[PDB]
Amino acid sequence: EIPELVPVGEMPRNLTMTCDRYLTNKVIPGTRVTIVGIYSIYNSKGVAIRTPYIKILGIQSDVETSSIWNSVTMFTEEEEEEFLQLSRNPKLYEILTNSIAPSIFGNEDIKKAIVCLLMGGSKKILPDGMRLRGDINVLLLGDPGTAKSQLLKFVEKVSPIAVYTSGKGSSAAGLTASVQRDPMTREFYLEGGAMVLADGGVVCIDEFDKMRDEDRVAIHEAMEQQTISIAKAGITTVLNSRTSVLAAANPIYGRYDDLKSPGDNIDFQTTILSRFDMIFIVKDDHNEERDISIANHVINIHTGNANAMQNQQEENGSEISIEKMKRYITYCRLKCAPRLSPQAAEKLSSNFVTIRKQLLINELESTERSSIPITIRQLEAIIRITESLAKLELSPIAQERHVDEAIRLFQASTMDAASQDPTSLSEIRRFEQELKRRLPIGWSTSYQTLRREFVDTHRFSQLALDKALYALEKHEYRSGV
């Protein structure tokens, strides 16, 4: 009964219906429908009371959403033509970027990553028994109260192919698919869990950190295989899991704690991080001027008089009817699948091994192995490039490598904020302090001392002096004036 009606304190009553051959199977459960059918009564087998039901003469969708898209273009050639025109115009990429997460005040590269993930990485089926894994799951780490859960909810509202959930709200057993005993069959049947629903959909879930870890281990395997293999209770069913999971974990003590050891920071096991293949950070912005500007934005969206003008400003140019954004996203993920690396090949042949070499650089800065967390990051990154080029789709069209380079840079520094040390930046800060404790008082000045000690620092230069300057640079005519 009418989820909007919300009868206060009344359990929602349900009535049975019947459909005819040209009415049956039109709509799925969990979808609202405006019905026109005769009120109907029959005896279930309590005096003179009989089962109330409805015999339907017409079916209309209250949700109004079209049925399972069988590629029949209700948008027709016209709407998809302007969709391609938006793909033709590279500026529309930033339009979609800005439009996502209204009132967020920035985080544009984050929104770009979100758009790319929602866009769907292409699953390639090799002639071998293997098959390239298309979808990816993005990890959300950072300080609380930073619209992260808000952004997750917004994204899920944008794309209903999956369902927003929360860790505690989702049953710990069978998160992907729970096993339940049917009332009329004592056998525990397989009930579709969230990632069954999330399969074929980009899914956002809350409170990853708050969730018990043990079953979250069962999630990484399912997303890795893109299926869900169950042999529990003597039932060997395997169900596909084509989903893009958006994490929600405030790493430790709420805040991101970037200036602390990643093991302390990331309560999740680093194997889970690698298997989910994505990494991301929300840090403390500071920037009191930017904080002022954020306050302006938040009040503007908060006060209806101002809210309206930002609403129309976003709508005319950028927010462009979020619903038909979702429609275009469906059409253009249909446009993903045809080809995702025509323009890549030549430039990627260099940049792939390039990023591999920067990963080698990273292990060079992370001598002593910097503990377990940093070792597998190179492997998750090499898989990350392969999946993330498809994630970026070639952009709306044919712009894969030139932006994937920047995105890989963003991820590299993302991990470096946590992979610089096993206290993280605090240890290199201590290193640059125990460096500078001689620089002014001794250690000569003006690179002459660097030309003097260790015989022009040559032995010190390759590793020790590089570690020195990497710590020094942060504390030590184009933008200001």
Binding site: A231, I235, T386
Partner: protein, 273 residues
């Protein structure tokens, strides 16, 4: 009439056909010593390196002779290999490749299955009306190659159950009212991650994996996969992935969406053959 076709991707119901042409083929290579290495290379063509690992999995695939004795003691010819590897070491895909390569291919993960369910469920069935035997994997395991992933995560009761039942290759199933003993001889591959994210040499291997040596000794091969990275080998892996990625699947339009269709196989029954 019924045509059983349970082979993956609609194959030959896991029943490989045979011709005298094919019979005389291969054999001349079998005389050549390199044939074993060629077969090893053929395995996991999507993966780069791990040649010794590929030889090990090849040896896995071929089935040993179950030596029998005039007593309760019957020697097992099954091949059991345990492997520990870092995440994303392709071993999961490796297990998957063994799966799609094997005929029976009973595979799951440590969290994938319930140990009692896979071994034996002695619950009743309502239609039957009395207590039923329901072996999720065990009865499926016997007479076929089987796999297990992330056995470190596997329920410890299942671990102790598999212990000595994979050594004796038979399960008594004397639990509850039913006491019939059913044989469970099969070849099993184990792929469990280290307790630490990656195997640390400073840590002991049994420090790196908490799985006890109980039946861990009863693995015909033991393997450690470490994702250490070297410029030459890193370039090798990268180039392999580059070849695998830009490669359009066989035929099809270059700008064509993935089909993975039903294949509309008209041939059914002896037509399918």
């Amino acid at each position: 009439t019924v045509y059983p076709l349970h082979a993956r991707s609609t194959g030959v119901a896991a029943r490989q056909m045979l011709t005298d042409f094919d019979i005389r083929n291969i054999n001349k290579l079998s005389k050549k010593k390199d044939i074993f290495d060629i077969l090893s290379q053929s395995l996991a063509p999507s993966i780069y390196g791990h040649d010794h690992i590929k030889k090990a999995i090849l040896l896995m695939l071929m089935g040993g002779v179950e030596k029998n004795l005039e007593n309760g003691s019957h020697l097992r010819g099954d091949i059991n290999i345990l492997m520990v590897g870092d995440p994303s070491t392709a071993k999961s895909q490796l297990l998957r490749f063994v799966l799609n390569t094997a005929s029976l291919a009973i595979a799951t993960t440590g969290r994938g299955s319930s140990g009692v369910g896979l071994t034996a469920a002695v619950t009743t069935d309502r239609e039957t009306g009395e207590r039923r035997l329901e072996a999720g994997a065990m009865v499926l395991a016997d007479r076929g190659v089987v796999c297990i992933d992330e056995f470190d995560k596997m329920t410890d009761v299942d671990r102790v159950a598999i212990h000595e039942v994979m050594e004796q290759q038979t399960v008594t199933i004397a639990k509850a009212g039913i006491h019939t003993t059913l044989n469970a001889r099969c070849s099993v591959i184990a792929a469990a991650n280290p307790v630490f994210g990656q195997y640390d040499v400073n840590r002991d291997p049994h420090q790196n994996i908490a799985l006890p040596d109980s039946l861990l000794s009863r693995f015909d091969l033991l393997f450690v996969v470490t994702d250490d990275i070297n410029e030459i080998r890193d370039r090798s892996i990268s180039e392999h992935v580059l070849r695998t990625h830009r490669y359009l699947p066989p035929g099809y339009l270059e700008g064509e969406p993935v089909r993975e269709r039903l294949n509309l196989s008209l041939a059914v029954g002896e037509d399918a053959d």
